């Protein structure tokens, strides 16, 4: 019955186009949130401990900070040792000074030497927050209305961003960044699911891949907003500012029709369909359960393969990032070039899905990335100019795999009884992101260029496995427990 309703009103409309723009703006905001952390708090040029006698001397003679470095520098980067006039001398753990004028997270929180480890621990905590946020917000968003959970998640993102902009100390900052990652994950999941649902099953690939376009576009935009405003709090406030305007949507963006019409209310769905028409014209799901998500062989196998694919994609991308290094000799130029280069791969995704399907591009991209990383592992010493070129095609392949697998993940799961297994799989990807550095170091300890080989076989076997997905095209979206009957 819903199909016919889509035929009478649906597909592409003026209001639907406006809502699509709104939700892809939500996606680009999530892109800023996810990625801006790498830019926040870059390592300063020079940091060092200064003594109380040294501080008095410097303030009396008026040394410039740069000359203070040039004269006071020990050893012969940032030295972890200081001169103690009160000779070779012991390390210092207080009174640090940073020469770089640009404000950074490490300057404020004093993450240097051994303390430099919690700089990466902040990324670890944010990624764990993404994990737990997917894990909880799946159930939270399926329990209540999708749009309601989206709005509360946007409010949470805004409030948490504001509070972390003015966080006084490191522990409160870390816990609030955790509580901000949870809400950002909620926003991204709800927004993508609702924008995918509101569109009919003809240009659904277009809507998904174009909101991915907007995520990449946000990655592209990030260097500009990062470079124009120096102050760290400035970047954080700028990143979290759109969340409030997005809270402001409210009545403009309606609830997704299909989720509403599950025998629960019915009349409200008819009213909202009449509203969107304008002049152009079972047991209640209750709450999801993990056993039901794992129940039945087809559902179990699809879920496990999807989690494996997410994990492999995350770990291979993390492994390849270190080998990519710096391109062009400047961070801004490198980041901008990578962001721009992302786009042609995504347009290729669009056209190749349009011609035949999704599973073949998925497998091809995964195999391409695996072969690229394996070749980088086995390359003979030399080709320094060509060192950059390799492992870049692999990165494009991994990003393509991310986009295709995320769209397929949205497509496969039954919307009415969705536990946000999309969110749970993304959380398993997040878990892979957390453990990736430790596993990478452990593998690299025994022999160098070993982790690249391991990830090459992992990506190859993932590309072999992903062929097993059904990948039915034009079947619209499964309802309730009908997911089994596509096969
Ligand atoms: C789902 C986030 N997303 C990613 C994920 C990503 C991105 C940058 C990282 C930078 C440093 C470390 C990890 C990193 N990750 C996690 C693998 C990668 C391409 C994407 C392409 C299109 C849309 C989303 C993408």
Curated annotation (Swiss-Prot):
Originating organism: Homo sapiens
Transmembrane regions listed in the UniProt entry: 19-39, 147-167, 206-226, 234-254, 333-353, 420-440, 450-470
Other notes: Mediates the uptake of clinically used drugs including neurotoxin 1-methyl-4-phenylpyridinium (MPP(+)) and platinum-based drug oxaliplatin. Plays a role in the anticancer activity of oxaliplatin and may contribute to antitumor specificity.
NCBIfam families named in the record: 2A0119
Annotated consequence of substituting residue 315 to F: Decreased TEA uptake
Name the record gives this protein: Solute carrier family 22 member 3
Lineage, broadest ranks: Eukaryota, Metazoa, Chordata, Craniata, Vertebrata
Tissue: Expressed in liver. Expressed in intestine. Expressed in kidney in proximal tubular cells. Expressed in placenta. Expressed throughout the brain, including cerebral cortex, cerebrellum, substancia nigra, medulla oblongata, hippocampus, caudate nucleus, nucleus accumbens and pons with low levels of expression detected in nearly all brain regions. In testis, mostly localized to peritubular myoid cells and Leydig cells, and weakly expressed in developing germ cells.
Glycoprotein recorded as keyword: yes
Keywords for this protein: Cell membrane, Glycoprotein, Ion transport, Membrane, Mitochondrion, Nucleus, Transmembrane, Transmembrane helix, Transport
Gene name as annotated: SLC22A3
Listed GO biological process terms: cellular detoxification; dopamine transport; dopamine uptake; epinephrine transport; epinephrine uptake; histamine metabolic process; histamine transport; histamine uptake
One GO location term (cellular component): neuronal cell body
pH effect on activity, per entry: Optimum pH is 8.5 for agmatine and MPP(+) transport.
Function: Electrogenic voltage-dependent transporter that mediates the transport of a variety of organic cations such as endogenous bioactive amines, cationic drugs and xenobiotics. Cation cellular uptake or release is driven by the electrochemical potential, i.e. membrane potential and concentration gradient. Functions as a Na(+)- and Cl(-)-independent, bidirectional uniporter.
Keyword Zinc belongs to the record: no
Superkingdom of this protein's organism: Eukaryota
């Amino acid at each position: 019955s819903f199909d016919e309703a889509l035929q009478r009103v649906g597909e592409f409309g003026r209001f639907q186009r406006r809502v699509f723009l709104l939700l892809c703006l939500t996606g680009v905001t999530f892109a800023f949130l996810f990625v801006g952390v790498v830019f926040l708090g870059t390592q300063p040029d020079h940091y060092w401990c200064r003594g109380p006698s040294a501080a008095a001397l410097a303030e009396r003679c008026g040394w410039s900070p740069e000359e203070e470095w040039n004269r006071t520098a020990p050893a012969s980067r940032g030295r972890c040792q200081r001169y103690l006039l009160e000779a070779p001398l012991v390390p210092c753990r207080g009174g640090w000074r940073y020469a770089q004028a640009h404000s950074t997270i490490v300057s404020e929180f004093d993450l240097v030497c051994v303390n430099a480890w919690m700089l990466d621990l902040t990324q670890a905590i944010l990624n764990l927050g993404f994990l737990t946020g997917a894990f909880t917000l799946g159930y939270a968003a399926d329990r209540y209305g999708r749009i309601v959970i989206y709005l509360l998640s946007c409010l949470g993102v805004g409030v948490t961003g504001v509070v972390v902009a003015f966080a006084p100390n490191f522990p409160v900052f870390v816990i609030f960044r955790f509580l901000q990652g949870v809400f950002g994950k909620g926003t991204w999941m709800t927004c993508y699911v609702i924008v995918t649902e509101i569109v009919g099953s003809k240009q659904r690939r277009i809507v998904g891949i174009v909101i991915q376009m907007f995520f990449t576009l946000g990655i592209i935009i990030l260097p500009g907003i990062a470079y124009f405003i120096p102050n760290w709090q400035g970047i954080q406030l700028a990143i979290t500012l759109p969340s409030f305007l997005f809270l402001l949507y409210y009545w403009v963006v309606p609830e997704s029709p299909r989720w509403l019409i599950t025998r629960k209310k019915g009349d409200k769905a008819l009213q909202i369909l009449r509203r969107i028409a304008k002049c152009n014209g079972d047991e209640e799901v209750s709450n999801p359960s993990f056993l039901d998500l794992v129940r039945t062989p087809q559902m179990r196998k699809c879920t496990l393969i999807l989690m494996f694919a997410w994990f492999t994609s995350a770990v291979v991308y993390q492994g390849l990032v270190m080998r990519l290094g710096i391109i062009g000799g400047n961070l801004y130029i490198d980041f901008f070039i990578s962001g721009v280069v992302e786009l042609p791969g995504a347009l290729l995704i669009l056209l190749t899905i349009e011609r035949l399907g999704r599973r073949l591009p998925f497998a091809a991209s995964n195999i391409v990335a695996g072969v690229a990383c394996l070749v980088t592992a086995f390359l003979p010493e030399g080709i320094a100019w060509l060192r950059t070129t390799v492992a870049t095609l692999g990165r494009l392949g991994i990003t393509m795999a991310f986009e295709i697998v995320y769209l397929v993940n949205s497509e496969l799961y039954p919307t009415t009884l969705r536990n946000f297994g999309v969110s749970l799989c993304s959380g398993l990807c997040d878990f892979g992101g957390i453990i990736a550095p430790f596993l990478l170091f452990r593998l690299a300890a025994v022999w160098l260029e070993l982790p690249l080989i391991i990830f090459g076989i992992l990506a190859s076997i993932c590309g072999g496995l992903v062929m097993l997905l059904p990948e039915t095209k034009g079947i619209a979206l499964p309802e309730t427990v009908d997911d089994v009957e596509k096969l």
